[PDB]
Amino acid sequence: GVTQEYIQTTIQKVTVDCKQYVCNGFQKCEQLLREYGQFCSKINQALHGANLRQDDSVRNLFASVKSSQSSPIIPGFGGDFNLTLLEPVARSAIEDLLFDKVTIADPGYMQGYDDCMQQGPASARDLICAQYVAGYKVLPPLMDVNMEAAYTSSLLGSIAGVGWTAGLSSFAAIPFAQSIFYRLNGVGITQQVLSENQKLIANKFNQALGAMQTGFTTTNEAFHKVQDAVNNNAQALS
Amino acid sequence: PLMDVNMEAAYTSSLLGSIAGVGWTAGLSSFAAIPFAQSIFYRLNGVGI
Amino acid sequence: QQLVRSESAALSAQLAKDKVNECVKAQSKRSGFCGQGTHIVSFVVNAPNG
Amino acid sequence: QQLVRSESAALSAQLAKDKVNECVKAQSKRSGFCGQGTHIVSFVVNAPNGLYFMHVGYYPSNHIEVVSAYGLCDAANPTNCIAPVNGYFIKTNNTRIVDEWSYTGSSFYAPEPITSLNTKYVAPQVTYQNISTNLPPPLL
Amino acid sequence: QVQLQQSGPELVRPGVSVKISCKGSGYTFTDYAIHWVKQSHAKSLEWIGVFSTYYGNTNYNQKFKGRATMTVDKSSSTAYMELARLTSEDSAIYYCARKSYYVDYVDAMDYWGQGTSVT
Amino acid sequence: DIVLTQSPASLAVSLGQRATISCRASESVDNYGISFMNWFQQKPGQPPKLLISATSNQGSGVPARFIGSGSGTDFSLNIHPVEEDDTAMYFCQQSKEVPRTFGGGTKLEIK
Amino acid sequence: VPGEMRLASIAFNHPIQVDQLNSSYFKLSIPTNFSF
Amino acid sequence: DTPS
């Protein structure tokens, strides 16, 4: 059977123009604000440091994600196990299911500024267009989704496996099913039972795998947490 | 509070009954059901006595 | 508000890193971490902000 | 502000305490913790407002691919199977060893004759290689 | 500069054991196994056995399991080999050779001794 | 070990002629695609000399003219520039299994 | 003095690939050198 | 740009 968890690693990165949030360059404001100009400098510095911390954590995480070596991945990887998490070579279909069920507003960057502007649909209601009214700026993530996809496939390539000593030097490079059998002997299941039930194991395993298509409901708490991470980011801007 | 204190006590009663097995592999599913004294000696052999 | 959230995110990110270096990279006998059914291989995928 | 800083410092101090009672006092197999090169001894020194750690580590280089087997049996006797302990059985590429197979450590490439010190008896499996003539560990 | 100096040929009488030697030169003697083969005719040759010079490990042709053996004097950098129970059918040319791996996992016979013979 | 045979038992050629030697095995010798086939050269009054190995048609003590060929049960040697000093007995040898037996060989000669 | 800054892609270092073989034997990757 |  399966369980799921969501662990947030970032806060959306934003900056605020400290002139524009107060006024639009009207000159009475422009002169009056000078008395408080050092507060804006403190505001900008604090926001800047916060954004640096967000990018620091990303690099630190990826340093542990990378491996010196990994298996290539082709269709039919994992043998008789279904492995629908494999990419549609692409981001995995499972990642796309998550992205489709999430209710987040359409992204900035491209076309950005011209998706605020009249050269687009009249029905846009994005806070991203409000970014260019309010003086907000939403910074792009450091991680790049394509590079991120490469990192997640690299992790899949380290599978098979965890056994055969620490695994921190050598790379076993063996089929997935064999690593499963190794793990099941690791929990006291006899080898004889495992050989008798090999197809049964694959069937029960793929039954649990198939249950992932019911995993995107509001009753799935990990899914709910993903949605509220998005809600919190949008809420602060609003 | 979310839970009645008697149910909370019932949860800790089950923890007292979860002792022995402690070891005997990871102990994850099997239950040895042996006397407390025996589990103590098992733990004492765990440090080489 | 942003500073507080950023710090909690940093701590949360450390937890994720710990699971990658334990729950994913190795079988574990510890219970606790990972799903509660002993442990057998676990997987991780990209999610927004995490 | 001062109260907030104090609380975060207490949590940070707990982390340091945990590493002194694991990362420093003993070798650890968890990885993640300590330096990123397996683990070997680490040291700690005083620093203003805190503790400063140094972690010695092991970094692999010049990786090669070799042929290896899951285990070895005996074509004359299916119940005689063995498997390496904390190491691997690899096909021999060394002129000192007359045997077709050799034992190595997993942290560093280094072939050696297979001996009973490096093996354990295991239940047989279909993927184990069968020896058609001579395998000295055990001879019988 | 690898060399083996095989010992000279002998017309040994039957039922006498026969010892042959071939000291190494120009390489570290203990890092390579010695191969021993028999030539009864220019078209008829067979492997006799192998001796590790580092660990003393051996293997032999099963026809000679109750017959010939090999030994090494590591301090003298030399190999010796001997055949028990000589018969007239055992007259042959013999050669020491050095183990090598020009290809991964492929045993090669590399350098060869000049040959010796027994009758 | 697997039995080796070779043909033609002798071959006579003109100088500079291309030439080849067949060398069948009783059973395929490839294990993990390694093959383990060595060819040797010998002349009377001399020890055998290594020529080639199954993945080495250059090096291993010879010029590129000694071309190894084949897989499974069939192997051959191909030399496009035969010279009078290439006349020798030639022997396939199998390192795949003990005893590490080898073929009776064939002999090349200039007409 | 120095010229203009240069735009660049962020590099991605690929792991060394190792083949996952069929049947009873397999390729194994092992380091041949190390450093402290 | 590169160092002096």
Side-chain angles (χ1 to χ4, degrees), chain H:
Chain H
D1 207 350
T2 58
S4 67

Side-chain angles (χ1 to χ4, degrees), chain F:
Chain F
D1 195 14
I2 295 170
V3 174
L4 302 179
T5 187
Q6 295 178 227
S7 67
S10 178
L11 179 65
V13 299
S14 67
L15 290 170
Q17 189 174 332
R18 67 183 294 168
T20 187
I21 302 171
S22 176
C23 186
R24 294 187 68 196
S26 69
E27 179 177 2
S28 296
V29 302
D30 296 342
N31 190 20
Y32 317 142
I34 294 168
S35 295
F36 304 96
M37 173 63 73
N38 294 312
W39 290 72
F40 293 81
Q41 181 181 62
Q42 189 178 17
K43 295 187 287 188
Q46 301 182 344
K49 303 292 182 178
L50 179 65
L51 297 174
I52 60 171
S53 296
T55 64
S56 178
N57 65 351
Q58 63 181 29
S60 302
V62 300
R65 72 177 64 184
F66 293 85
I67 301 168
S69 180
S71 68
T73 63
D74 296 352
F75 295 93
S76 66
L77 174 66
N78 182 26
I79 302 170
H80 291 172
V82 173
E83 297 184 67
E84 186 176 1
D85 292 334
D86 294 323
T87 56
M89 292 84 76
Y90 292 101
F91 304 86
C92 296
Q93 179 266 328
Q94 188 65 56
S95 294
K96 188 275 191 183
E97 192 170 355
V98 297
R100 303 185 186 287
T101 64
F102 57 99
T106 66
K107 182 177 180 182
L108 185 64
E109 185 175 358
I110 299 302
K111 294 178 182 181

Side-chain angles (χ1 to χ4, degrees), chain A:
Chain A
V2 297
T3 66
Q4 299 88 40
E5 183 60 278
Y6 172 64
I7 301 175
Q8 185 175 3
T9 63
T10 63
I11 304 298
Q12 185 177 42
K13 297 178 295 179
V14 300
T15 69
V16 179
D17 185 309
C18 193
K19 188 177 297 291
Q20 293 301 318
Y21 193 81
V22 175
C23 64
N24 295 129
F26 294 103
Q27 292 298 299
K28 295 302 291 183
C29 176
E30 187 63 19
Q31 296 306 314
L32 290 170
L33 190 59
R34 295 174 73 180
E35 298 301 318
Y36 308 106
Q38 65 283 3
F39 297 135
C40 286
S41 295
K42 290 178 181 180
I43 291 169
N44 288 338
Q45 289 171 5
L47 290 173
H48 181 71
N51 289 334
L52 291 174
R53 297 295 81 76
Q54 293 291 311
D55 290 341
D56 290 339
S57 68
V58 171
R59 292 193 308 277
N60 288 339
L61 178 61
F62 285 155
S64 66
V65 171
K66 190 172 294 297
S67 172
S68 294
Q69 60 278 314
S70 70
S71 177
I73 298 173
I74 63 170
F77 182 76
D80 291 345
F81 294 83
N82 283 340
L83 274 75
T84 61
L85 276 60
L86 295 174
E87 301 84 348
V89 297
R91 298 182 303 274
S92 67
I94 299 302
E95 287 163 316
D96 286 339
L97 289 172
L98 180 60
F99 292 148
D100 289 346
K101 296 297 182 182
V102 171
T103 62
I104 192 167
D106 288 348
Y109 296 138
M110 304 303 293
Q111 297 299 311
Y113 179 107
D114 290 319
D115 293 324
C116 187
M117 185 175 180
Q118 68 185 338
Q119 297 178 336
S123 66
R125 295 293 180 269
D126 289 344
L127 291 176
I128 296 300
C129 170
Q131 181 184 325
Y132 303 104
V133 177
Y136 300 155
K137 183 172 175 61
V138 178
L139 298 177
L142 182 58
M143 67 179 71
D144 192 322
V145 68
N146 288 340
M147 292 178 72
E148 172 58 352
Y151 277 120
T152 59
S153 68
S154 296
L155 290 173
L156 292 174
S158 69
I159 296 171
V162 303
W164 317 110
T165 70
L168 299 177
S169 60
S170 67
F171 180 57
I174 63 171
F176 176 76
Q178 295 304 312
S179 75
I180 294 300
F181 293 145
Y182 183 97
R183 288 186 184 83
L184 294 177
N185 283 332
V187 296
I189 297 169
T190 65
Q191 183 176 328
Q192 184 64 46
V193 169
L194 293 174
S195 69
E196 294 298 326
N197 291 282
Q198 292 176 72
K199 289 182 178 179
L200 181 60
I201 291 167
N203 287 337
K204 289 181 176 180
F205 187 103
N206 286 329
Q207 185 63 54
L209 186 153
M212 290 302 294
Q213 300 303 306
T214 63
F216 302 89
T217 67
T218 61
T219 64
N220 183 297
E221 293 301 326
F223 178 75
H224 182 71
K225 288 168 69 173
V226 172
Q227 183 62 49
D228 285 340
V230 172
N231 290 337
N232 287 337
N233 288 340
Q235 184 62 56
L237 292 174
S238 71

Side-chain angles (χ1 to χ4, degrees), chain B:
Chain B
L2 183 59
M3 184 67 71
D4 188 285
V5 71
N6 289 276
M7 292 298 95
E8 293 177 346
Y11 276 110
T12 60
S13 295
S14 70
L15 291 174
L16 292 174
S18 297
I19 296 169
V22 68
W24 312 105
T25 66
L28 300 177
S29 61
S30 68
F31 185 66
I34 62 172
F36 181 77
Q38 297 305 314
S39 75
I40 293 298
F41 291 131
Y42 181 85
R43 289 185 188 83
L44 292 174
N45 288 327
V47 295
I49 297 169

Side-chain angles (χ1 to χ4, degrees), chain G:
Chain G
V1 299
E4 303 85 350
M5 290 182 180
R6 297 171 295 277
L7 179 147
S9 176
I10 298 170
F12 181 93
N13 186 6
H14 289 287
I16 297 169
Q17 297 301 292
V18 180
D19 293 338
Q20 182 183 290
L21 277 64
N22 288 321
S23 193
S24 68
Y25 69 105
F26 57 95
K27 291 182 181 180
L28 174 67
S29 175
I30 304 173
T32 62
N33 204 343
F34 67 94
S35 179
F36 283 103

Side-chain angles (χ1 to χ4, degrees), chain E residues 39 43 47 95 103 105 107 112-113, chain F residues 36 38 42 47-48 55 95 99 104:
Chain E
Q39 176 174 317
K43 297 293 184 64
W47 181 81
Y95 303 93
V103 175
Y105 314 122
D107 187 342
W112 291 78
Chain F
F36 304 96
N38 294 312
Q42 189 178 17
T55 64
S95 294

Side-chain angles (χ1 to χ4, degrees), chain D residues 52-134:
Chain D
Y52 185 90
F53 295 78
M54 181 176 69
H55 307 284
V56 178
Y58 179 91
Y59 298 92
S61 180
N62 298 333
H63 294 258
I64 63 171
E65 295 176 340
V66 299
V67 174
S68 178
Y70 292 105
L72 301 171
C73 296
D74 184 347
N77 184 341
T79 62
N80 202 33
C81 306
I82 63 171
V85 178
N86 295 324
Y88 305 98
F89 289 155
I90 60 171
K91 196 73 186 60
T92 52
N93 203 49
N94 189 319
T95 58
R96 290 178 179 175
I97 300 171
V98 300
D99 289 350
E100 297 298 313
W101 300 94
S102 178
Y103 178 81
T104 182
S106 68
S107 295
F108 180 74
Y109 179 74
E112 63 185 342
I114 299 169
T115 66
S116 66
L117 292 174
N118 295 317
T119 65
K120 62 183 180 180
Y121 294 95
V122 298
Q125 186 172 359
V126 71
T127 63
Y128 293 169
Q129 302 300 307
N130 296 311
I131 302 301
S132 69
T133 57
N134 184 22

